Design a protein around this ligand. Structure first.
Ligand SMILES: Nc1ncnc2c1ncn2[C@@H]1O[C@H](CSCC[C@H](N)C(=O)O)[C@@H](O)[C@H]1O
Ligand SMILES: Nc1ncnc2c1ncn2[C@@H]1O[C@H](CSCC[C@H](N)C(=O)O)[C@@H](O)[C@H]1O
Ligand SMILES: CC(C)CC(=O)C(=O)O
Ligand SMILES: CC(C)CC(=O)C(=O)O
Ligand SMILES: [Zn+2]
Ligand SMILES: [Zn+2]
Lengths: 333, 333
């Protein structure tokens, strides 16, 4: 009678309460630096972490107790905590909410301004690239790193280069899997680079993996970074020079064709626009609208990407569907 | 082989991509003023709405085309659009994400500051109460209005008062259901009040439903607003005077006991702290942490609320479980 109001409410809400909570807790925690210490297989030692993160130990404890109540962490002893068993899936899902609602917040809040004067708006309302890079890492863990990772592990490379590498997770994983390998991760944002270095350091690969703060446009006139490369990867960057710097794009591509050690290949994970299929359409639209309207970057269809890679020297070019909606992996030898 | 990477990715992502997209689209749209015109049973006429919202018609069209691609709206003709059939459920779910990630953003971003100097932080990092009120309306539609609404429709009241009424949706619904009734909605935030007036006006109840901009603390010394009331409701406000203004709280309660027309009752929908049950625990924790740590407002358990209402003059007090996690409806005659 009001028990049916209960059942119908629960069904209408579905998984949104759980996800809303997880996303807020994890973004707050990641900004504090706490989340990097949360793993289902490792312990977080409050005495040490509080001191490393320069937080009052009592404050950290109240946070972790809140997250314990939430069911996201387990208290092992006093000042010892570990993530819940399914933590990595929960964090992955929170990646999508963080990306749309956090990284892209300036577009949500100031749409009026973008509509009436784009140029003034584009330079007034700027995204935090630390947030851009972290949220994409969380999405990538399960939805776009695995395919690219598995492709790269085969043909056991020696040298791997990643353009627009963000927090450098793919390289950390590649280098962890192939025993004797080197990596260089290139990214134009101080905030991302700083975060990448800390993550690389934490993974104890500081000497094998170089973080260089440069544009991808840089590589057009300065391919001194590529050569000797078995694999070159670029994840969601190539679009940041379209449709304006088209010539510079085709120049970076040509440079990649040359610098490649004779066996290897260019791997591009990127986003195609406005898909129609039921599974991808909704998040497709969000990625496409943010890119087209707010960032004025051109997303190319599957067809167009294949054409571009061909008429830039590469042959044997195929495209793969990724779990990430509108995400596609292009392999070009 | 990479088709299993696909299946496993899709399963790991689950409904998070769809929800992330919906939440971003709808918050952006609501800030523009577009979402109030989206209904599965009504049409949005771009020529008129663009002019009413003072937007360039082309800009509105590109938004609506993006949302059409997303599957959230249907294009009826040229410059005519309607919401998808399940729009109201999608908006309801987006309410939770908007609440945790948007309304409460100052707490997510500046946790460090709250940890080290609470007083300076509390007055530097302030929530937008327009966002607080709208997001709670979206959550309430399916998860806390229905029970309170059905209780109030019985005993067909003449006069209904709602303390901390926000965007005044419950009153609009109550007044829509009982043919000859009056309402007054009280709320301390200019931004919420302004939004309520516009919504009341849109529902053509402008003369029946009064919006008064006052505190709930106001009512302690000035019960001239209550008397002649068949029902007094307060949804998620009573906590905003605990644990500091405890005396003023018990004074507002006593005032409610008197002013009630002899048949009627006080109805309190509010939030209890840190539930443990599997269904409620995660979002429970988020509501509880934001309230306890960031806002320093005291949430009372079910037991405590019943006790308070009793030793304030009311008898026949029961508590009902709501679909909204940690939400409980208290009826006090
Ligand atoms: N012109 C440019 N040159 C280099 N990096 C760029 C760039 N424009 C944007 N970027 C970077 O590209 C990244 C986009 S998202 C991060 C992608 C990362 N490879 C991942 O898959 O997880 C950001 O780190 C951003 O700072
Ligand atoms: N001391 C106070 N007096 C009156 N209203 C208050 C208040 N403190 C907060 N509020 C208001 O209480 C609301 C909390 S959330 C909105 C609740 C609304 N009744 C609903 O269920 O949808 C906000 O609108 C906020 O501005
Ligand atoms: C699509 C995202 C994964 C990356 C991106 O392009 C961006 O955030 O700008
Ligand atoms: C719990 C919410 C519905 C309302 C609230 O108390 C708030 O946002 O402050
Ligand atoms: Zn981009
Ligand atoms: Zn509150």
């Amino acid at each position: 009678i009001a028990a049916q109001h209960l059942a119908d409410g629960i069904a209408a809400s579905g998984p949104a309460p759980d996800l809303a909570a997880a996303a807020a807790f994890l973004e707050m925690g990641d900004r504090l630096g706490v989340v990097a210490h949360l793993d289902p297989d490792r312990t977080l030692e409050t005495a040490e972490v509080a001191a490393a993160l320069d937080l009052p130990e009592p404050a950290l404890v109240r946070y972790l107790d809140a997250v314990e109540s939430a069911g996201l962490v387990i208290r092992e002893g006093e000042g010892r905590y570990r993530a819940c068993p399914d933590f990595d899936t929960i964090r992955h899902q929170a990646g999508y909410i963080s990306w749309t609602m956090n990284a892209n917040r300036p577009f949500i809040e100031n749409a009026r301004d973008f509509f009436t004067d784009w140029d003034k708006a584009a330079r007034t309302h700027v995204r935090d690239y630390r947030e851009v890079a972290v949220s994409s890492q969380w999405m990538g863990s399960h939805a776009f790193y695995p395919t690219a990772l598995a492709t790269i592990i085969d043909a056991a490379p020696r040298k791997v280069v990643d353009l627009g590498a963000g927090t450098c997770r793919l390289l950390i994983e590649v280098l962890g899997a192939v025993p004797g390998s080197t990596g260089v991760g290139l990214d134009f944002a101080a905030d991302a680079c700083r975060a990448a270095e800390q993550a690389v350091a934490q993974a104890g690969m500081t000497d094998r993996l170089t973080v260089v703060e440069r544009t991808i446009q840089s590589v057009a006139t300065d391919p001194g970074v590529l050569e000797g490369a078995d694999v070159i990867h670029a994840g969601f960057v190539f679009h940041d020079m379209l449709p304006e710097e088209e010539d510079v794009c085709d120049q970076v591509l040509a440079n990649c064709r040359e610098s490649l050690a004779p066996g290897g290949f260019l791997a591009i994970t990127d986003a195609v626009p406005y898909l129609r299929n039921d599974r991808e359409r909704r998040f497709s639209a969000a990625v496409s609208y943010y890119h087209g309207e707010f960032m004025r970057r051109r997303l190319q269809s599957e067809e167009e990407w294949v054409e571009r890679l061909r008429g830039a020297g590469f042959s044997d070019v195929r495209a793969l569907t990724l779990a990430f909606p509108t995400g596609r992996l292009f392999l070009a030898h």
